Design an enzyme around this catalytic site. Structure first.
Site, PDB file in Angstrom:
ATOM      1  N   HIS A  53      -1.185 -12.722   1.577  1.00 21.03           N
ATOM      2  CA  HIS A  53      -1.999 -13.443   2.569  1.00 21.03           C
ATOM      3  C   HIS A  53      -3.038 -12.548   3.234  1.00 21.03           C
ATOM      4  O   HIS A  53      -3.946 -13.055   3.923  1.00 21.03           O
ATOM      5  CB  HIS A  53      -1.140 -14.209   3.595  1.00 21.03           C
ATOM      6  CG  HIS A  53      -0.654 -13.388   4.747  1.00 21.03           C
ATOM      7  ND1 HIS A  53       0.627 -12.872   4.817  1.00 21.03           N
ATOM      8  CD2 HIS A  53      -1.262 -13.046   5.908  1.00 21.03           C
ATOM      9  CE1 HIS A  53       0.770 -12.216   5.957  1.00 21.03           C
ATOM     10  NE2 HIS A  53      -0.357 -12.321   6.640  1.00 21.03           N
ATOM     11  N   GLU A 113      -7.840  11.190   8.602  1.00 18.48           N
ATOM     12  CA  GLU A 113      -8.150   9.973   7.855  1.00 18.48           C
ATOM     13  C   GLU A 113      -8.680  10.232   6.447  1.00 18.48           C
ATOM     14  O   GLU A 113      -9.408  11.215   6.189  1.00 18.48           O
ATOM     15  CB  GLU A 113      -9.207   9.169   8.599  1.00 18.48           C
ATOM     16  CG  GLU A 113      -8.817   8.723   9.980  1.00 18.48           C
ATOM     17  CD  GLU A 113      -9.277   9.653  11.094  1.00 18.48           C
ATOM     18  OE1 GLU A 113      -9.707  10.806  10.801  1.00 18.48           O
ATOM     19  OE2 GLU A 113      -9.221   9.207  12.262  1.00 18.48           O
ATOM     20  N   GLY A 148      -1.840  -9.410  12.787  1.00 17.87           N
ATOM     21  CA  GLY A 148      -2.413  -8.046  12.694  1.00 17.87           C
ATOM     22  C   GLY A 148      -1.460  -7.039  12.086  1.00 17.87           C
ATOM     23  O   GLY A 148      -1.913  -6.038  11.525  1.00 17.87           O
ATOM     24  N   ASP A 197       4.795 -13.349  -1.247  1.00 14.81           N
ATOM     25  CA  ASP A 197       3.708 -12.828  -0.400  1.00 14.81           C
ATOM     26  C   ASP A 197       3.594 -11.319  -0.572  1.00 14.81           C
ATOM     27  O   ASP A 197       4.033 -10.513   0.286  1.00 14.81           O
ATOM     28  CB  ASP A 197       3.925 -13.242   1.059  1.00 14.81           C
ATOM     29  CG  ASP A 197       2.708 -12.988   1.934  1.00 14.81           C
ATOM     30  OD1 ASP A 197       1.618 -12.708   1.394  1.00 14.81           O
ATOM     31  OD2 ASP A 197       2.849 -13.094   3.177  1.00 14.81           O
ATOM     32  N   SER A 205       0.536  -8.061   9.679  1.00  9.66           N
ATOM     33  CA  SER A 205       0.575  -8.625   8.315  1.00  9.66           C
ATOM     34  C   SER A 205       0.387  -7.576   7.251  1.00  9.66           C
ATOM     35  O   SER A 205      -0.577  -6.820   7.319  1.00  9.66           O
ATOM     36  CB  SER A 205      -0.597  -9.591   8.131  1.00  9.66           C
ATOM     37  OG  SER A 205      -0.429 -10.810   8.805  1.00  9.66           O
ATOM     38  N   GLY A 206       1.233  -7.594   6.215  1.00 12.99           N
ATOM     39  CA  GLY A 206       1.019  -6.727   5.051  1.00 12.99           C
ATOM     40  C   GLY A 206       1.675  -5.359   5.239  1.00 12.99           C
ATOM     41  O   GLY A 206       1.858  -4.597   4.275  1.00 12.99           O
ATOM     42  N   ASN A 246      -5.264   6.350  15.905  1.00 11.47           N
ATOM     43  CA  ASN A 246      -6.194   5.515  16.612  1.00 11.47           C
ATOM     44  C   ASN A 246      -7.236   5.012  15.609  1.00 11.47           C
ATOM     45  O   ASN A 246      -7.979   5.808  15.018  1.00 11.47           O
ATOM     46  CB  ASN A 246      -6.878   6.282  17.744  1.00 11.47           C
ATOM     47  CG  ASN A 246      -7.641   5.369  18.644  1.00 11.47           C
ATOM     48  OD1 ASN A 246      -8.392   4.501  18.169  1.00 11.47           O
ATOM     49  ND2 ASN A 246      -7.419   5.495  19.958  1.00 11.47           N
ATOM     50  N   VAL A 263     -11.052   5.785  16.517  1.00  6.89           N
ATOM     51  CA  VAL A 263     -11.484   7.183  16.733  1.00  6.89           C
ATOM     52  C   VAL A 263     -11.279   7.999  15.467  1.00  6.89           C
ATOM     53  O   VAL A 263     -10.203   7.941  14.859  1.00  6.89           O
ATOM     54  CB  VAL A 263     -10.721   7.849  17.909  1.00  6.89           C
ATOM     55  CG1 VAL A 263     -11.193   9.295  18.102  1.00  6.89           C
ATOM     56  CG2 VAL A 263     -10.935   7.068  19.199  1.00  6.89           C
TER      57      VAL A 263
HETATM   58  N1  PMJ Z   1       4.649 -22.411   5.826  1.00  7.48           N
HETATM   59  C1  PMJ Z   1       5.173 -21.820   6.886  1.00  7.48           C
HETATM   60  N2  PMJ Z   1       6.198 -20.980   6.698  1.00  7.48           N
HETATM   61  N3  PMJ Z   1       4.629 -22.045   8.098  1.00  7.48           N
HETATM   62  C2  PMJ Z   1       5.168 -21.452   9.333  1.00  7.48           C
HETATM   63  C3  PMJ Z   1       4.422 -20.166   9.718  1.00  7.48           C
HETATM   64  C4  PMJ Z   1       2.929 -20.400   9.931  1.00  7.48           C
HETATM   65  C5  PMJ Z   1       2.307 -19.347  10.857  1.00  7.48           C
HETATM   66  N4  PMJ Z   1       3.104 -19.184  12.097  1.00  7.48           N
HETATM   67  S1  PMJ Z   1       2.184 -18.961  13.454  1.00  7.48           S
HETATM   68  O1  PMJ Z   1       2.001 -17.502  13.750  1.00  7.48           O
HETATM   69  O2  PMJ Z   1       0.839 -19.560  13.239  1.00  7.48           O
HETATM   70  C6  PMJ Z   1       2.995 -19.766  14.885  1.00  7.48           C
HETATM   71  C7  PMJ Z   1       2.649 -21.256  15.130  1.00  7.48           C
HETATM   72  C8  PMJ Z   1       1.324 -21.681  15.341  1.00  7.48           C
HETATM   73  C9  PMJ Z   1       1.037 -23.038  15.563  1.00  7.48           C
HETATM   74  C10 PMJ Z   1       2.076 -23.979  15.590  1.00  7.48           C
HETATM   75  C11 PMJ Z   1       3.399 -23.557  15.393  1.00  7.48           C
HETATM   76  C12 PMJ Z   1       3.688 -22.201  15.166  1.00  7.48           C
HETATM   77  C13 PMJ Z   1       2.275 -18.010  10.106  1.00  7.48           C
HETATM   78  O3  PMJ Z   1       3.149 -17.183  10.312  1.00  7.48           O
HETATM   79  N5  PMJ Z   1       1.280 -17.841   9.238  1.00  7.48           N
HETATM   80  C14 PMJ Z   1       1.112 -16.569   8.504  1.00  7.48           C
HETATM   81  C15 PMJ Z   1       0.847 -15.507   9.586  1.00  7.48           C
HETATM   82  O4  PMJ Z   1       0.265 -15.821  10.637  1.00  7.48           O
HETATM   83  N6  PMJ Z   1       1.343 -14.281   9.346  1.00  7.48           N
HETATM   84  C16 PMJ Z   1       1.188 -13.192  10.325  1.00  7.48           C
HETATM   85  C17 PMJ Z   1       2.501 -13.012  11.111  1.00  7.48           C
HETATM   86  C18 PMJ Z   1       3.139 -11.769  11.148  1.00  7.48           C
HETATM   87  C19 PMJ Z   1       4.332 -11.563  11.841  1.00  7.48           C
HETATM   88  C20 PMJ Z   1       4.914 -12.628  12.533  1.00  7.48           C
HETATM   89  C21 PMJ Z   1       6.125 -12.454  13.236  1.00  7.48           C
HETATM   90  N7  PMJ Z   1       6.451 -13.216  14.295  1.00  7.48           N
HETATM   91  N8  PMJ Z   1       7.029 -11.560  12.851  1.00  7.48           N
HETATM   92  C22 PMJ Z   1       4.244 -13.860  12.516  1.00  7.48           C
HETATM   93  C23 PMJ Z   1       3.064 -14.072  11.814  1.00  7.48           C
HETATM   94 CA    CA Z   2      -8.757   7.173  13.292  1.00 12.64          CA
END
Ligand code: PMJ
Ligand code: CA
Length: 223
Positions: free
Chosen positions: A40, A62, A175, A84, A177-178, A54, A57
């Site tokens: 994603h 880096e 943020g 994913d 993510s990944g 940071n 900076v």
């Molecule tokens: N098909 C599924 N499984 N759908 C559920 C998850 C979708 C979305 N969750 S979400 O952050 O937008 C929360 C939300 C927003 C609107 C309405 C209800 C809930 C979400 O997580 N989307 C991907 C994303 O945003 N990934 C980044 C991320 C990283 C870490 C976390 C965490 N809490 N550990 C959550 C999201």
């Molecule tokens: Ca830096």
């Protein structure tokens, strides 16, 4: 990362920042030429930033290296987040040192209760917004799949696991993510999804890396 702590500069030397004019995702360095991140996080024109603390900076350790190729998992499904995971090849090999180091792939899956380290430059608030400039860290245990499943109306597949806290306060967030979930020196998880962050009954869902080791090794060997 909500409810974590400042890692300390370069104390997580496999942590990378993916940048397309700004940081947008994390990733993990698995050898001098390859990064593992989330599908994603896919974007055209990714630059991999190694040795970062940071991210606003130039601090001196880096390495910035453009991606030559991105490979999203053949079966990534953007609606379920199943599979994913994404590999990114660097245009040139990173220069490995104590601040820029690769993390091992697992040979076995990790068991519930195991302590892991999750890190990233994502949102630090469960409500509202504050993006840190330095890398944040969170120690978090792998949860039971059953509790994982009760926590959501969405599918949790055998390629996912839950880690963190059902009582809220401590979680990865947007943020992050990944980025890595590292348990006993092995990359076991990739920050994937969750309903909000650090909310009660909504712990984090992570891509289960141990399921993908054959794919990772074969892909790297052929590319
Ligand atoms: N098909 C599924 N499984 N759908 C559920 C998850 C979708 C979305 N969750 S979400 O952050 O937008 C929360 C939300 C927003 C609107 C309405 C209800 C809930 C979400 O997580 N989307 C991907 C994303 O945003 N990934 C980044 C991320 C990283 C870490 C976390 C965490 N809490 N550990 C959550 C999201
Ligand atoms: Ca830096």
């Amino acid at each position: 990362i909500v409810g974590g702590y400042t890692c300390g500069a370069n104390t997580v030397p496999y942590q990378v920042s993916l940048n397309s004019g700004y940081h947008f995702c994390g990733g993990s360095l698995i050898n001098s030429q390859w990064v593992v991140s989330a599908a994603h996080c896919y974007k055209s024109g990714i630059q991999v930033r190694l040795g970062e603390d940071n991210i606003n900076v130039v601090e001196g350790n880096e390495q910035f290296i453009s991606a030559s190729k991105s490979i999203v998992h053949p079966s990534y499904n953007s609606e379920t987040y199943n599979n994913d995971i994404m590999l990114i090849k660097l245009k040139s090999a990173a220069s490995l040192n104590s601040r820029v180091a690769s993390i091992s792939l697992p040979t076995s899956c990790a068991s519930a209760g195991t302590q892991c380290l999750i890190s990233g430059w994502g949102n630090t608030k469960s409500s509202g917004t504050s993006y840190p400039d330095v890398l944040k860290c969170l120690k978090a245990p792998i949860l039971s799949d059953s509790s994982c499943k009760s926590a959501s109306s969405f599918i949790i597949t055998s390629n996912m696991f839950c880690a963190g806290y059902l009582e809220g306060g401590k979680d990865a967030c947007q943020g992050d993510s990944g980025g890595p979930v590292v348990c006993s020196g092995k990359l076991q998880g990739i920050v994937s999804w969750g309903e909000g962050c650090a909310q009660k009954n909504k712990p984090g869902i992570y891509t289960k890396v141990c399921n993908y080791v054959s794919w990772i090794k074969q892909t790297i060997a052929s590319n």
